[PDB]
Amino acid sequence: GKLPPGPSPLPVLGNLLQMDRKGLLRSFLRLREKYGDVFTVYLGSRPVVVLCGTDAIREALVDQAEAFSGRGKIAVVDPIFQGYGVIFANGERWRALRRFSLATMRDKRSVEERIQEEARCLVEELRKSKGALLDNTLLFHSITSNIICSIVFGKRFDYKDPVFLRLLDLFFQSFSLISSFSSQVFELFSGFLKYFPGTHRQIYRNLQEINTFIGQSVEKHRATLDPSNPRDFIDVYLLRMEKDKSDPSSEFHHQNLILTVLSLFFAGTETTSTTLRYGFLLMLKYPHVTERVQKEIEQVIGSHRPPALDDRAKMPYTDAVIHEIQRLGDLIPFGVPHTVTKDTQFRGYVIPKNTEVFPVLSSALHDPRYFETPNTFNPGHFLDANGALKRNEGFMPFSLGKRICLGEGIARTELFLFFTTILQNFSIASPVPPEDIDLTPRESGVGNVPPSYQIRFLARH
Ligand code: HEM
Ligand SMILES: OC[C@H]1O[C@H](O[C@H]2[C@H](O)[C@@H](O)[C@H](OCCCCCC3CCCCC3)O[C@@H]2CO)[C@H](O)[C@@H](O)[C@@H]1O
Ligand SMILES: *C(=O)Cc1cc2ccccc2c2ccccc12
């Protein structure tokens, strides 16, 4: 017995009265001030253990990896996934799906070359605009999704493709709704609120419309399949289904196929797109940073050949900028919920099997032990005296352990290549003066959404 300390819950409302009106994160952080780095809060009738500060998150996700390798539910999307797909699977199912998903993408065209192709495509599209004002939200969604579309469907979509844009539109307005205050209220009281209209029904329709698109893509694949030459993620999955016909315990069937594909879209598009969008807002607010990036781009890569992934090792400052963008961006602030896979002894407290655990990544990315000024943009957080890249234990935007972001490599490959290839060909400007640029996110929840802004991409001759 004895859970981490916490405020006295009510039978139904849990700790509702102890919460902050600003959000779940702001509630989590306010309770840390009173109860410390590891506490219990009751979101409704269920208890969750919240983990604050670098040291405590590492003590759980790294030191007791297996115990904290369990995935928790998110109320607004569970109806879609229902424990199927790689993100929300558990036990043997997750282990199977994740291993497959790693091994599949770990090896036609490499993921690096696909990203380079999208980079080239983006630069060509940005030249068209001829240095006019634009909101980069749409294009940043397109490129990120086009990487996943390349991995999954075995091709990419033109930026002004209407069906692509329509399904992109609805898929992305889903993240806006997921990160809303209303959806956070739904997290606590889904048991009652599910029978009533709300954001959750819209998120339901939007994700089902994509599941439907995936479903029929799977069928186009099943019908154009060449076993000798699997073109993408789906083909490899389908061939795996054939190999596991006789095995009754195989997880490689329809529901897992559909929802793993969505999972790769659901996870591998938005935050990447948002990180890039936040990136350029900071790059507008700090032209001198941008200038030493482009200076480093010039020195290492040139202005002729496109940037490649082995240039990163030779570009510590740009790498430090990217790290710092990711750190300050803080796109998944209270992380994605884990559960303990068994009864777990932790920091003198005992966490009962299947209890939900919240690794607050914001409290780690803003840890004053590891960063001088946690609230100020400073690529220097990741630079030593020699101007070399410097690992920082507080840096965990992809979380840690067995559940670490399955697509870390891909993300950082996207981030690097997109940032460098854009800034190689383009200098940036905005009608808003640097010192007048606001960084406060438009929405804050399980995802942070940076405010929308106008930007110029001016070709460099
Ligand atoms: C800006 C880039 C990205 C960031 C910061 C990010 C962050 C995260 C975080 C915080 C988690 C939760 C891990 C946990 O349970 O603690 C996660 C999980 C996951 N991510 Fe990402 N992500 C990014 C992009 C991607 C990409 C490009 C992919 C692949 C296409 C991807 C695929 C996944 C998957 C499959 C999981 C669940 C893995 C599991 O539960 O075992 N993500 N990511
Ligand atoms: O090139 C023309 C031929 O290709 C067609 O493919 C269509 C298909 O109808 C269809 O696959 C496609 O629509 C794709 C919508 C994009 C969905 C991807 C989203 C899913 C996740 C969230 C964001 C991206 O549009 C394609 C047009 O390029 C069809 O196969 C034919 O009708 C047509 O003759
Ligand atoms: C950024 O990738 C957004 C995001 C990722 C994610 C990854 C795994 C599980 C759940 C995730 C999210 C849930 C809710 C909102 C955003 C995300």
Swiss-Prot record:
Q: What are the subcellular locations of this protein?
A: Endoplasmic reticulum membrane; Microsome membrane
Q: How does it sit in the membrane?
A: Peripheral membrane protein
User: Which parts of the chain span the membrane according to its record?
Assistant: none
UniProt-listed Enzyme Commission number(s): 1.14.14.1
* Keywords assigned: Endoplasmic reticulum, Heme, Iron, Membrane, Metal-binding, Microsome, Monooxygenase, Oxidoreductase, Phosphoprotein
Q: Which InterPro entries match?
A: Cyt_P450 (IPR001128), Cyt_P450_CS (IPR017972), Cyt_P450_E_grp-I (IPR002401), Cyt_P450_E_grp-I_CYP2B-like (IPR008068), Cyt_P450_sf (IPR036396), Cytochrome_P450_fam2 (IPR050182)
Its GO biological process terms? epoxygenase P450 pathway; xenobiotic metabolic process
This protein's GO CC annotations: endoplasmic reticulum membrane
Function, as annotated: Cytochromes P450 are a group of heme-thiolate monooxygenases. In liver microsomes, this enzyme is involved in an NADPH-dependent electron transport pathway. It oxidizes a variety of structurally unrelated compounds, including steroids, fatty acids, and xenobiotics. In the epoxidation of arachidonic acid it has a unique preference for the 5,6-olefin.
Q: What is this protein called?
A: Cytochrome P450 2B4
Q: Where does this protein come from, organism-wise?
A: Oryctolagus cuniculus (Rabbit)
Q: What is the lineage of its organism?
A: Eukaryota, Metazoa, Chordata, Craniata, Vertebrata
